[PDB]
Amino acid sequence: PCIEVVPNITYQCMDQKLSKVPDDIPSSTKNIDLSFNPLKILKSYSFSNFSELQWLDLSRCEIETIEDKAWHGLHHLSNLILTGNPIQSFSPGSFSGLTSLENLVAVETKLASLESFPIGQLITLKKLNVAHNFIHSCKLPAYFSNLTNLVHVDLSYNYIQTITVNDLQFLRENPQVNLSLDMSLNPIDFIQDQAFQGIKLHELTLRGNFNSSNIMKTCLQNLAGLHVHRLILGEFKDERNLEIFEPSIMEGLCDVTIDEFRLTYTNDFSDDIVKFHCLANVSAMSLAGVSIKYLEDVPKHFKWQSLSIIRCQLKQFPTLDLPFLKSLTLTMNKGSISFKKVALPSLSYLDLSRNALSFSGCCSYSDLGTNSLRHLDLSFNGAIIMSANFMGLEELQHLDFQHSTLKRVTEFSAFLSLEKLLYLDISYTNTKIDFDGIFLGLTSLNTLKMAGNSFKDNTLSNVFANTTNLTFLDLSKCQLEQISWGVFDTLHRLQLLNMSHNNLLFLDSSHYNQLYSLKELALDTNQLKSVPDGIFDRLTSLQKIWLHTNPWDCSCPRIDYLSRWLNKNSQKEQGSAKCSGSGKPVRSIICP
């Protein structure tokens, strides 16, 4: 029984209609997955001779009783997953011997409270998950004093309706305790005054708690005092959403102290919420799944240092003059918006990917208003028209255009001023390289990804002549039929060359003479019938080579160098080169 995953190491007994734990398992096993077996009960010393288990998963095991002493041989076990088990009685120290336990997951374990929960010995704990249970107390037992390393707790989907100054009575005792709390999906109506006074919370998640405005409004006023790092706030498309939602509802956040705010989906939304006055002193404003439609007039004093808009619904591209902003991220937009000028002189990181965004007259200082941009991701978008070669942006190390429709890139040296650029991806941009100076300027370039494109006369021309420090080059799917002389003569630091998925008919030994530091060469799935003798002999750093899916002609004496060569080097060949007609491997063939 059981599956074979990483033998004597990870196994999968999931859903093996098992009576109980099988001994027919290597003792060295470090990963078991018994979930979905009618075990019903955990007869003790069950996990005794599986002595170096790390990851135990007993989800949906129908278990009613932990006959304690069950976890004895497991000094080093970290993950224990008991989800969906009808355990009523967690009889004290039931978690016996689990000395190295970091992560405890007792979701839907029919649990009434932490009071009745025998976990005070497990100092090693960090994560505790008691979501989906029968809990009503926000309060944290006094034995957390003992659990030094506990850093996060998850009470979402319980029955907590109320938060008192006592529920929290404990964080006050140790305001040098880093804890994070998730209370999403708890039908909360009451937090009392001063409940959240002098409290130290890292991540507090309040999602889908409130049934209507007034409850939230008021519950929120009564967080006052709290210093929090990350407050996550919103509701859910599949639950009861506040029919109405006005910014007023976050009065008193102005008493709550936040560095990262994070708004999620909400039935009713108001563009005025992100302008809302109580968020001015966040250092990481952030939106997700939100139906915000415009984003203009964000007051200039605001101290947002990163902003991030994700899966939202902008109709038009933000107007932003925020001078303290270091990272903008607008991504997966519903729209097809079109880029508009900005002025964020503090900006260093711009990810505008996946918006079907359209960008006319890219790219220079004028467009952005910083001289310290290092990362421009314009990938998965629409028509990017290159009318400007990055004058002003010369601090850049990451340019991604992949899968967008770049236009005019071959009409001048469009990347001329990008002398510090380390990574360029123009793969899949429907670009046809008509011009050999396409890449002038890019003297620092390491990674060049330019698959899925094409070349004048299907010829790989001399476009790399001074992209000398190139270490990764992808020319896969570029319809190449051949390669002009000289092209690679300078790429001495090149390590990976991919020229697979092309239509090459021959190769020429005049290319590989100087790829001194090259370790990887894909030439698979072209149309080579053959290779010149000795072609690979000067590739002194070589490790892997792909050559399959070419119709190699195995007539001797022709196929001799290569057969011999691959046989000697079989270790390096990835996949398997084969003969036209016969279908036999190439390393197999022996000439007289």
Binding site: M14, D15, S35, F36, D57, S59, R60, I81, T83, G84, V105, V107, E108, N129, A131, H132, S156, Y157, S184, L185, G208, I232, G234, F236, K237, D238, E239, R262, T264, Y265, A288, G289, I310, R311
Partner: protein, 137 residues
């Protein structure tokens, strides 16, 4: 082996399990889908064989034998998602019902298939696989 059906102004939806993945789940619309346009709910009841943190779908649709290319559809992106069920862990109870709303395109008439493999992004393990059948007028 149907597990459901429903009739409507144009559509006669219905689904069985996939020959190769029978893992259980139960699921229903409200109303029955009109391809011309429709607001409603999708009632889903089942207990997953893996975490839904990164839930997504693979749809293999086909009209009158004409295969459409594999269509992909993400539900849980694994960050600040819009659905409760995204937090579901492996072997947890899931009952929710999901609102949906759409105005129709003109679909060609006849016999549609669609297998919908659900998949857990975190592991690419298939969670389940339905096999719908839609007939349109």
């Amino acid at each position: 082996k149907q597990q459901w059906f429903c009739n409507s102004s144009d559509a006669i939806i219905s689904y069985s399990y996939c020959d190769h993945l029978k893992f259980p789940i139960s699921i229903s619309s409200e109303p029955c889908i009109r391809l011309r346009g429709t607001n409603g709910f999708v009632h889903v009841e089942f207990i997953p064989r893996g975490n839904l943190k990164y839930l997504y779908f693979n749809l293999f649709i086909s009209v009158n034998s004409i295969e459409l290319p594999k269509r992909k559809e993400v539900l849980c992106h694994g960050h600040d998602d819009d659905y409760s069920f995204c937090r579901a862990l492996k072997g947890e109870t899931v009952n929710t019902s999901i609102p949906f709303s759409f105005e129709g395109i003109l679909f060609p008439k006849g016999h549609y298939r669609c297998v919908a493999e659900a998949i857990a992004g975190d592991t690419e393990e298939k969670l389940f696989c339905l096999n719908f059948t839609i007939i349109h007028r």
